[PDB]
Amino acid sequence: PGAAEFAALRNRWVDQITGRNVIQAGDPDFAKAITALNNKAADSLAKLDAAAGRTSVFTDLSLAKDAEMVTTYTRLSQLATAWATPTAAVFGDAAVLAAIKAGLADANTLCYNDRKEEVGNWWSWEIGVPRALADAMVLLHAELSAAERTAYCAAIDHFVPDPWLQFPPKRGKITSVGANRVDLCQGIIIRSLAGEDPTKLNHAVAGLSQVWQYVTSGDGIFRDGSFIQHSTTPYTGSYGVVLLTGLSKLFSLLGGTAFEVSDPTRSIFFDAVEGSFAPVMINGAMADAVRGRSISREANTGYDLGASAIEAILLLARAMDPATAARWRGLCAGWIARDTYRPILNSASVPRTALVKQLEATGVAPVAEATGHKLFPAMDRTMHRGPGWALSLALSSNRIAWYECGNGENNRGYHTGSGMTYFYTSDLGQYDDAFWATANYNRLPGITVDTTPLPDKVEGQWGAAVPADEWSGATALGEVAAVGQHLVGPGRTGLTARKSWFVSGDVTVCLGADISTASGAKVETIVDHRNLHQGSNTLTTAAGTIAGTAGTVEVLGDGRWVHLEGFGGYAMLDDSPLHVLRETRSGSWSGVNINGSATVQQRNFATLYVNHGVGPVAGSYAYMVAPGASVDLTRKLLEGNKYSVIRNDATAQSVEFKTAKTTAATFWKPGMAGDLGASGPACVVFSRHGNELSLAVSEPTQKAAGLTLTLPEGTWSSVLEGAGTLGTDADGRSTLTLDTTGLSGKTKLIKLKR
Ligand SMILES: CC(=O)N[C@@H]1[C@@H](O[C@@H]2O[C@H](C(=O)O)[C@@H](O[C@@H]3O[C@H](CO)[C@H](OS(=O)(=O)O)[C@H](O[C@@H]4OC(C(=O)O)=C[C@H](O)[C@H]4O)[C@H]3NC(C)=O)[C@H](O)[C@H]2O)[C@@H](OS(=O)(=O)O)[C@@H](CO)O[C@H]1O
Ligand code: NA
């Protein structure tokens, strides 16, 4: 590949990043994308340092601060993008061009050059600047001189001599992985287009292959579809999206060329569209539970990341086989159509606009999110859906950190891995509308919490500490899931709790047992902590209403149920007092992220909780949530033994779903829950249909070689579906013995015949 091939590649990259070849004339959405492009460009030009002998490019960005160095370069690449976009205000403007070139030249001289040692965050030097400077070189290729290309290529190569590695020499260089490997390889590939370097280009393309190989530990994609970055944090929704985005752009750039990605194992990455990404996409947003510290970012939200994922999937779909293309397009049409809260075209780039318009021109229909369960045991996450809702559970364990904080972000998120119950609904803004600026970080929905105040950054940054718990894990059979978490509290309080969730097609039954702590403080369990925005949503009870006055907590009378207008129902499954608080909360994004705005946001919440008191001995809870239930259906939840608690203690927790004729259990110790026994830790769901017993089982520690069940519903003499060895114990009950060696928390499905 020579001059013509490199020119075609550069032209293709500019087409991709500007959308210059696909602007529809007179289209209002294209006009709006151009307007947003123009306003950002004008903002940057207004901030140019025009001073003689300047020591910065922009008056509000110091080159001595590595994040502001990155923003200097991303502003220059944005300006170059605008200069290259037909109909943009600065399109082809020579005075603007000259300012961009001078900015690149001075940022090189002053700071980012082949003689400079890294100072501060490695990512700035190796990923933030190279991607932007490479883009700028390609955008401006007809305008920069050879000597300028030499200088800027030399700078990139100094900081990133090999994109398969990361960190400056003084630190010791390690293999780059996951999103970091993609981003380093992107910067080098685009730089290799500018400099016409096939050797560097080929090595960077070859570096992509590692990121879609299945892993069983560390960072990457697991066979169950989990995605981890930073070793201990579930990360599909932020770092996973960075990986998805970069590969979409590079696969598209290189396809059909001498440099095309030809590794056949890239099918694993395509499999991850539905296996990893789609289940954690909720009406256009990535689930908070899989986006780590990014929850703290006012302008990098679940909708921003979901929109990036949609762009990427649409871009990838252009190269897929027809059935897969249409499936991915239907999925995206659904995530777009259902999201009226942050419509994808508002502030969309020209390329994003074009992909969304191309989708709408295919006529591919919107696909609904499927009901039922998607489990991710390698990352301690589960997803559950029914009509009008999606539950995302956020656990932690000896494999998965309580939380990630870092770079001044999410330092207060230490309870976000304490068994959170995110109920996503048609309230699309629930977790987005200043939730993370205003919520009570000590009363997040679903958690059990020791009320001891914890410092910011408790347990350390970067997910360095994990709870030394017994297990967290899950299974599911048909419409019912069983999820368990042994919660060990952050901050060395000694909090312990056994939390389980039994999730049907409509209702979530929440059981807690064996709760105690060493701190001497009260312990709570949060039934909900629910953003009401500026609403005054009524809390209805058997007797009338509760918590009508903000700031005065009330205890629920005897009917045991409460309905929250615009949400659904809650009901107590024991005689514990339920405390109900309507409250107004305030906070700024600066309070949760060092980069957040200082603007104070004020939001109303409904907060429902159980108080286990001081010094609980084997404290417990039992409640249920019915998203979307009317007052009439909520009033009836506790009637007819629909949700039949079997056991709830330090040995096992179990419920039977009457309508679904299905029982679910978690086992902490060897023992029995009803007529089901287990020899050790287990998640089990079972249902009898006449003379056939169906079971789902997991071994949630991920470390036991065997597990034996004592079977419910009488005796069982053959195996119809699946594996396992039938036996009989000294007492005449049938047993099922499973080899669980290496199952990594995955579910075994079994069907037996009487
Ligand atoms: C300082 C240090 O040595 N810390 C490491 C830690 O490194 C940190 O983690 C990541 C990484 O990629 O591994 C890197 O996170 C990325 O940070 C940049 C800003 O620096 C962006 O954050 S933002 O400014 O809030 O935008 C970036 O956000 C993503 O950007 C983009 C994009 O630019 O294309 C798209 C997404 O929409 C947006 O989310 C952010 N990425 C994510 C996904 O949040 C940190 O800057 C770097 O400091 C880890 O290093 S590691 O390489 O071994 O993983 C950590 C692991 O234990 O070790 C610390 O020492
Ligand atoms: Na970590």
The amino acid at residue 577 is P
Residue 276 CB–ligand 1 contact under 6 Å: no
Q: How far apart are CA 483 and CA 500, in angstroms?
A: 5
The answer to whether residues 294 and 235 touch, using CB atoms and an 8 Å cutoff, is: no
Residue to mutate (ligand 1; options 407, 409, 410; most atoms within 8 A of CB)? 407
Provide the token pair at 584: 């107004």
The amino acid at residue 594 is I
Provide the token pair at 422: 């995110």
- Residue ranges of domains in the chain, CATH in brackets: 1-369 (1.50.10.100), 370-640 (2.70.98.10), 641-754 (2.60.220.10)
Q: Helix or strand or coil: residue 384?
A: strand
Q: How far apart are CA 86 and CA 18, in angstroms?
A: 9
Nearest in space to 38 (alpha carbons), one of 96, 92, 79, 99: 79
Q: Helix or strand or coil: residue 613?
A: strand
Nearest in space to 124 (alpha carbons), one of 71, 76, 193, 201: 71
DSSP type of residue 441: T
Cα 123 to averaged position of ligand 1 atoms, centre (Å): 7
Q: How far apart are CA 445 and CA 402, in angstroms?
A: 15
Q: Helix or strand or coil: residue 338?
A: coil
The answer to whether residues 691 and 706 touch, using CB atoms and an 8 Å cutoff, is: no
Specify the residue with its C-alpha closest to ligand 1, atom 23. 300
Between CA 313 and CA 323, with CA 317 as vertex, the angle to 5 degrees is 125
- For the beta carbon of residue 719, count every other beta carbon within 10 angstroms: 15
The answer to whether residues 652 and 668 touch, using CB atoms and an 8 Å cutoff, is: yes
- For the beta carbon of residue 43, count every other beta carbon within 10 angstroms: 11
Which ranges of 631-714 does DSSP label H, i.e. alpha helix? 631-636
Diameter over CA atoms, the chain: 93
By the 10 Å C-beta count (0-12 exposed, 13-18 middle, 19+ buried), 718 is classed as exposed
DSSP type of residue 599: P
Cα 443 to averaged position of ligand 2 atoms, centre (Å): 24
Q: Helix or strand or coil: residue 251?
A: helix
Residue to mutate (ligand 1; options 66, 75, 123; most atoms within 8 A of CB)? 123
Provide the token pair at 415: 């309870």
Cα 84 to averaged position of ligand 2 atoms, centre (Å): 40
Q: Which residue has the tokens 């293309």?
A: 325
| Resolution given for this structure, in angstroms | 1.2
Dihedral over alpha carbons 113, 119, 122, 124 (to 10 degrees): -60
Q: How far apart are CA 695 and CA 476, in angstroms?
A: 9
Task: Count Cα neighbours of 227 within 13 Å in the Cβ-side half-sphere.
Answer: 32
Query: Which residues are identified as catalytic?
Result: 230, 239, 293
Alpha-carbon separation of residue 743 from 468, 701, 702, 704 (angstroms): 21, 10, 7, 9
Residue 167 CB–ligand 1 contact under 6 Å: no
Going by DSSP bridges, is the β-strand pair 214-215/220-222 parallel, antiparallel, or unpaired?
parallel
Cα 462 to averaged position of ligand 2 atoms, centre (Å): 4
Cα 663 to averaged position of ligand 1 atoms, centre (Å): 43
Ligand with the closest atom to the CA of 459 = 2
Q: Which residue has the tokens 């370097």?
A: 197
Alpha-carbon separation of residue 441 from 53, 420, 703 (angstroms): 48, 11, 33
The amino acid at residue 498 is R
Secondary structure in 3-state letters for 274-298? HHHHHHHEECCEECHHHCHHHHHCC
Cα 294 to averaged position of ligand 1 atoms, centre (Å): 10
Nearest in space to 127 (alpha carbons), one of 206, 201, 74, 58: 74
Radius of gyration in angstroms for the set of CA atoms belonging to the chain, rounded to a whole number: 28
Residue 410 CB–ligand 1 contact under 6 Å: no
What pairs with residue 622 in β-bridges?
A: 511
Residue 186 CB–ligand 1 contact under 6 Å: no
Question: Cα dihedral sign for 195, 196, 198, 203?
Answer: positive
Nearest in space to 529 (alpha carbons), one of 567, 571, 483, 490: 567
Give the DSSP per-residue string, 124-154. IIIIIHHHHHHHHHHHTTTTS-HHHHHHHHH
Ligand with the closest atom to the CA of 233 = 2
Q: Which residue has the tokens 């700071």?
A: 111
| Residues counted in the chain | 754
- Phi, psi (5° rounding) for residue 542? -50, -40
Ligand with the closest atom to the CA of 69 = 1
Specify the residue with its C-alpha closest to ligand 1, atom 8. 123
Provide the token pair at 161: 């001599």
Specify the residue with its C-alpha closest to ligand 1, atom 10. 123
Residue 132 CB–ligand 1 contact under 6 Å: no
Q: From start to end of 298-386, where are the E strands?
A: 372-376, 381-386
DSSP type of residue 15: H
Between CA 291 and CA 301, with CA 295 as vertex, the angle to 5 degrees is 85
Residue to mutate (ligand 1; options 242, 290, 293, 595; most atoms within 8 A of CB)? 242
Q: Which residue has the tokens 């718990």?
A: 469
Alpha-carbon separation of residue 122 from 108, 173, 203, 291, 710 (angstroms): 17, 11, 21, 21, 55
- For the beta carbon of residue 667, count every other beta carbon within 10 angstroms: 28
DSSP type of residue 265: G
Q: How far apart are CA 96 and CA 215, in angstroms?
A: 48
The answer to whether residues 625 and 561 touch, using CB atoms and an 8 Å cutoff, is: no
Nearest in space to 525 (alpha carbons), one of 540, 511, 509: 511
Atom of ligand 1 nearest to the CA of 174: 53
Alpha-carbon separation of residue 548 from 51, 146, 423, 633 (angstroms): 60, 71, 23, 22
In sequence order, what are the residues at sequence separation of 6 or more whose Cβ sits closer than 8 angstroms to the Cβ of residue 365?
Answer: 330, 333
Cα 599 to averaged position of ligand 1 atoms, centre (Å): 25
Q: How far apart are CA 287 and CA 303, in angstroms?
A: 9
Q: Which helix (H) or strand (E) holds 726?
A: strand 725-728
- For the beta carbon of residue 164, count every other beta carbon within 10 angstroms: 18
Specify the residue with its C-alpha closest to ligand 1, atom 15. 123
Atom of ligand 1 nearest to the CA of 122: 3
Nearest in space to 753 (alpha carbons), one of 725, 727, 721, 720: 720
Alpha-carbon separation of residue 380 from 240, 401, 669 (angstroms): 16, 10, 20
Q: How far apart are CA 624 and CA 421, in angstroms?
A: 11
